[PDB]
Write a protein that binds this ligand. Structure first.
Ligand SMILES: CSC[C@H]1O[C@@H](n2cnc3c(N)ncnc32)[C@H](O)[C@@H]1O
Ligand SMILES: CSC[C@H]1O[C@@H](n2cnc3c(N)ncnc32)[C@H](O)[C@@H]1O
Ligand SMILES: NCc1ccc(N)cc1
Ligand SMILES: NCc1ccc(N)cc1
Lengths: 281, 281
């Protein structure tokens, strides 16, 4: 048995590895290299341009926290946009809210969707929901063109090298601002406090040029580099996203494996050094 | 340049790797294999039996949280025992409390101490403190024999395979109980919620057979497996260790890089699935 290893200039000097039970599918799509394997201990794994995007064992931690943070703060969210997220995990979590009327997803690479429907059936099951509408386009252009405004936008992107390069700049954050309702919320994958503090500061800086309240929360997930991933949180009201306005008690949420009411606020209690770096932006 | 890789039957199917700038020292001590290298991005690294024990870039997260959790809850701690901890990082953090009168350390392998004094000078600097007394012995025997009782015991062990095998059993926890003051606290390295839940349950079960209040807290640290490490927390009073009784405001604590008042309590807000596994023990 061989091993998959995740090396990158975005985290030089380190690498994480998973033992391969069997390769399931590889291809070169119009945007990126796509790989899918069954690991010996983390179940199935999806890779894009050499970088791990999810595994069945732990994806629930990142998908539950990116979704339920903003969706327990938003009072009555009707219309939600997912940027990126071809795997469908966010969408799966959004579907659990009966009151949601529409879920748009803008994903640049339809191969990701198709591969996920074929190889990750418990992650892509929400595509079946009649409220979901798929657009295959660069979200940088989609957000320049869209007529609707959203109650919540969840930016489930890949990393800045590759097709997501258009999603980590000031201009993208203006477009997010303009496409949210006046009391709307954005959350965005914002990388690892252990090694990407220069990025994190830039992103916070971009977001603060527009939004009243910009916060940062941290998620424990073994299969992203350094064992964790941040959520950059944007709010038009001074109140922000650390405090849920509701509990998730109905039967659609019984199965939740990471998120709960308490760890929502916990996730925003950051390490001393990050606070010190962040203040003064 | 070669890479160091951390493979183990304690985390099958995964491995974490660091790029090696230069090997500094290797030996076979009476208890274990010892390796020290300078990494390209994490600074210097100490390995024992193929397993990473610390790196200069991140050790502060594990050393600050294991120490300051219990030391902000203990009202006036006079006498503290460190089990394991040859590197001296706990001791470094303990020395910052002026009111501490004595710090005992029981480490089985003196080579670890010596290597740390030579190669990790900002981690071992606390050995110079006149309050510190070193015993070279298996802590399982030391705790059977010691006459003093402690206000706080910090069990900074290596993993269960190797010489620390005597420290992950019921009998060790009775010895810890008997060597604490009647209002005394123990904290112990208790592994990763992502992959060691069977262990975590056993340890909680051992601790609950004796202690009034057993809690579990989680630390984000990129260089342990799965990106995180737990602290098993033992308390003789129903009040427990989630809430600090003091703030660390004096000049000896200004330099702290992870711990603060808020993230003390945050660290005990665990993922939904762990709560579900833990309840009923
Ligand atoms: C896998 S979840 C992350 C997803 O982000 C998608 N992605 C990257 N860049 C963009 C973009 N500019 N617009 C929409 N989706 C993107 C990737 O194709 C990937 O499927
Ligand atoms: C490096 S911090 C962990 C330390 O635990 C020490 N250790 C392992 N087993 C025992 C034991 N039974 N008693 C004391 N120290 C131990 C190891 O030698 C190591 O230096
Ligand atoms: N789309 C989530 C994600 C997070 C971190 C990394 N590296 C890649 C994907
Ligand atoms: N002594 C701290 C420690 C924690 C986890 C592992 N694996 C090894 C050492």
């Amino acid at each position: 048995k061989k091993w998959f290893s995740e090396f990158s200039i975005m985290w030089p000097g380190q690498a994480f590895s998973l033992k391969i039970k069997k390769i399931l599918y590889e291809t070169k799509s119009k945007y990126q290299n796509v790989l899918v394997f069954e690991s010996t201990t983390y179940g199935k794994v999806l890779v894009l341009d050499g970088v791990i995007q999810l595994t069945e064992k732990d994806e629930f931690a990142y998908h539950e926290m990116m979704t339920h943070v903003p969706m327990t703060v938003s009072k009555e969210p009707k219309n939600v946009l997912v940027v990126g997220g071809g795997d469908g995990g966010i969408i799966r979590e959004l579907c659990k809210y009966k009151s949601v009327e529409n879920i748009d997803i803008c994903e640049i690479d339809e191969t990701v969707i198709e591969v996920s429907k074929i190889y990750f059936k418990n992650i892509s099951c929400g595509y079946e929901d009649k409220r979901v509408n798929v657009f295959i386009e660069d979200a940088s252009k989609f957000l320049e063109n869209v007529t609707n405004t959203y109650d919540v936008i969840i930016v489930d992107s890949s990393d800045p090298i590759g097709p997501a390069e258009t999603l980590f700049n000031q201009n993208f954050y203006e477009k997010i601002y303009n496409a949210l309702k006046p009391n709307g919320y954005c959350v965005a994958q914002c990388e690892s406090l252990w090694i990407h503090v220069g990025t994190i500061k830039n992103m916070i800086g971009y977001a603060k040029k527009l939004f009243k309240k910009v916060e940062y929360a941290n998620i424990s997930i073994p299969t992203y580099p350094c064992g964790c991933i941040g959520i950059l949180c944007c709010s038009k009201t001074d109140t922000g996203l650390t405090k849920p306005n509701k509990k998730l008690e109905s039967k659609e949420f019984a199965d939740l494996k990471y998120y709960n009411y308490e760890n929502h606020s916990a996730a925003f209690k950051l390490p001393a050094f990050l606070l010190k770096e962040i203040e003064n932006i």
